[PDB]
Curated annotation (Swiss-Prot), chains A, G:
Belongs to the herpesviridae CVC2 protein family. Capsid vertex-specific component that plays a role during viral DNA encapsidation, assuring correct genome cleavage and presumably stabilizing capsids that contain full-length viral genomes. Participates in the interaction between the capsid and the tegument through interaction with the large tegument protein/LTP. It comes from Epstein-Barr virus (strain B95-8) (HHV-4). It is found in: Virion; Host nucleus. Heterodimerizes with CVC1. Interacts with major capsid protein/MCP and triplex capsid protein 1/TRX1 at the pentamer vertices. Interacts with the large tegument protein/LTP. This is Capsid vertex component 2. The lineage of its organism: Viruses, Duplodnaviria, Heunggongvirae, Peploviricota, Herviviricetes.
From Swiss-Prot, chain C:
Belongs to the herpesviridae small capsomere-interacting protein family. The lineage of its organism: Viruses, Duplodnaviria, Heunggongvirae, Peploviricota, Herviviricetes. Interacts with the major capsid protein/MCP. The gene is SCP. Participates in the assembly of the infectious particles by decorating the outer surface of the capsid shell and thus forming a layer between the capsid and the tegument. Complexes composed of the major capsid protein and small capsomere-interacting protein/SCP assemble together in the host cytoplasm and are translocated to the nucleus, where they accumulate and participate in capsid assembly. This is Small capsomere-interacting protein. It is found in: Virion; Host nucleus.
From Swiss-Prot, chain E:
It is found in: Virion; Host nucleus. This is Major capsid protein. Self-assembles to form an icosahedral capsid with a T=16 symmetry, about 200 nm in diameter, and consisting of 150 hexons and 12 pentons (total of 162 capsomers). Hexons form the edges and faces of the capsid and are each composed of six MCP molecules. In contrast, one penton is found at each of the 12 vertices. Eleven of the pentons are MCP pentamers, while the last vertex is occupied by the portal complex. It comes from the Viruses. It comes from Epstein-Barr virus (strain B95-8).
Swiss-Prot record, chains F, H:
Belongs to the herpesviridae large tegument protein family. Large tegument protein that plays multiple roles in the viral cycle. During viral entry, remains associated with the capsid while most of the tegument is detached and participates in the capsid transport toward the host nucleus. Plays a role in the routing of the capsid at the nuclear pore complex and subsequent uncoating. Within the host nucleus, acts as a deneddylase and promotes the degradation of nuclear CRLs (cullin-RING ubiquitin ligases) and thereby stabilizes nuclear CRL substrates, while cytoplasmic CRLs remain unaffected. It is found in: Virion tegument; Host cytoplasm; Host nucleus. Interacts with host CUL1 and CUL4A; these interactions inhibit the E3 ligase activity of cullins. Interacts with inner tegument protein. Interacts with capsid vertex specific component CVC2. Interacts with the major capsid protein/MCP. Interacts with host TRIM25 and YWHAZ. It comes from the Viruses. This is Large tegument protein deneddylase.
Length: 68, 143, 77, 50, 50, 37, 68, 37
């Protein structure tokens, strides 16, 4: 029957045409790039702090051998 | 598991290196519609982009497995940025091509020795076994 | 953000009103700057809602804690 | 403060029982259910309160 | 024991180790008083629809 | 007498600061996973 | 009708481009999650070396008074 | 004598490998900047 064939095609055109839209945004990539540089600065900060403590402990080891 | 030593005594002495890969049935749900047939004839081939092109065709037999002590792996057993393809048939009308990729495998081969990896082409989790004897974006697009 | 339920009927001018709240100078930090009028006005009304809710939770925290033994001991004489 | 954001619908799709595992279609094996997150269930409203 | 899949919008969710990816944990109110500014800010700045 | 208070306590402070970078990289990389991805 | 052909190509170009935008963003997201896991394992994998060599320093320093 | 053998060589073994994790993040995060981003 052609009537129901056409009606199925028409409702099909509605939903099947509705399925077309899609979305994308750019700013997420740039914020994602910024966060890596921030975390790198933070890791360099803690690394230099613990390097200064490691350099200080050897100095304490040379300093407190005098007490014995 | 027997398929690995079968290959190493017959095909591993014809082909140099092998990476032994186990595929869950959920990953199999991608290719095959409405069927769960056993995967004997499945042909794995390599395909590498941007330098030269070649395929080498081989069967690794697949059987469903209870042997993982972990409950989660219950199921079937069979220059990084490139493709491998498994061509799966039966006696009936069913042909599927599955694409495994690298950098899930070289990272995955890190230690029942098993590790979970992700598909890029058809995203699901797969599981890689490691036996005790053991330009990005243009690369998928070409086909 | 595509479809939101329409805004509930509220009396306005709670910012420039006669009663004076200690939160009000911190509220002066926000400025229109980029935004058009109605967007910024409803946004700052939402921010004042957030401030009053923070104040209510803070006062509830201070209220719940209880009464010390020492104060009731002083309450003899 | 800890008031959550908008209500959502989340569909949990699991395989059926192992006694009922038998099927030609593996996708037929799953049965599925949509849970309403952060939302409540309610009776019919009045029209004055609508 | 059966294999579950959690469909949250468009994404699916299978493994236990990916738990704080799609699911967020919110503690009790006295504990969460550190994060509340961001808790309001995501209510305004962030995109809920995706 | 002295050096056991020197060469053990200071090493303990060094290790307890070494563990902070490991735990911080756990927290920061998981925060990158959850919040922007 | 020859005029509608162009319209068919225009809508098809739109859909084929949207498929690549969606696929590219999804694969970038998943592979970046994988590499965050990778860098996590990398920093742990040399933190193991750090702690093994720290224990080597202490385990041989306990033998210092047996080597003096 | 032996104190100089132990408590300097082993601190050099500590430092020359504590630089390695810093170098490793220097490699790998820039690898992310060029490769997946």
């Amino acid at each position: 029957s052609p009537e129901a064939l056409e009606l199925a095609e028409r409702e099909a055109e509605r939903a099947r045409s509705e399925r077309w839209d899609r979305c994308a945004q750019v700013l997420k990539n740039r914020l994602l790039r910024v966060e890596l540089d921030g975390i790198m600065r933070d890791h360099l900060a803690r690394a230099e702090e613990i390097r200064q403590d490691l350099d200080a402990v050897v100095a304490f080891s040379d300093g407190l051998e005098s007490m014995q | 598991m027997d398929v690995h030593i079968d290959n190493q005594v017959l095909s591993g002495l014809g082909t140099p290196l092998l990476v032994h890969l186990f595929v869950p049935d959920t990953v199999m749900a991608e290719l095959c519609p409405n069927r769960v047939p056993n995967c004997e004839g499945a042909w794995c081939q390599t395909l590498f982009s941007d330098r030269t092109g070649l395929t080498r065709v081989c069967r690794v037999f697949a059987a469903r497995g209870m042997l993982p002590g972990r409950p989660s792996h219950r199921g079937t057993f069979t220059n990084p940025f490139h493709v491998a393809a498994l061509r799966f048939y039966d006696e009936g009308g069913l042909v599927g091509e599955l694409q495994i990729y690298y950098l899930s495998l070289f990272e995955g081969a890190k230690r029942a020795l098993v590790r979970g990896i992700a598909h890029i082409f058809s995203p699901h989790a797969l599981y890689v076994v490691t036996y005790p004897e053991l330009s990005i974006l243009g690369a998928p697009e070409r086909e | 953000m595509a479809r939101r339920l329409p805004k509930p009927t509220l009396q306005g001018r709670l910012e420039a009103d006669f009663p004076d709240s200690p939160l009000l100078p911190k509220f002066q930090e926000l400025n229109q700057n980029n935004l058009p009028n109605d967007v910024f006005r409803e946004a700052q009304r939402s921010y004042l809602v957030f401030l009053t809710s923070q104040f209510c939770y803070e006062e509830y925290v201070q209220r719940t804690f209880g009464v010390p033994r020492r104060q009731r001991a002083i309450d003899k004489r | 403060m800890t008031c959550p954001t908008f209500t959502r619908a989340v569909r949990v799709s699991v395989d059926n029982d192992v006694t009922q595992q038998l099927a030609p279609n593996p996708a037929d094996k799953r049965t599925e259910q949509t849970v309403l997150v952060n939302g409540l269930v309610a009776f019919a409203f009045s029209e004055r309160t609508r | 024991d059966r294999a579950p899949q959690i469909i949250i919008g468009n994404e699916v969710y299978a493994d236990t180790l990916a738990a704080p990816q799609f699911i967020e944990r919110v503690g009790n109110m006295d504990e969460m008083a550190a994060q509340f500014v961001a808790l309001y800010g995501y209510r305004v700045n962030g995109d809920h629809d995706h | 007498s002295q050096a056991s208070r020197v060469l053990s306590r200071f090493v303990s402070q060094l290790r307890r600061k070494l563990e902070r970078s490991t735990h911080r990289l756990i927290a920061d990389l998981e925060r990158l996973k959850f919040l922007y991805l």
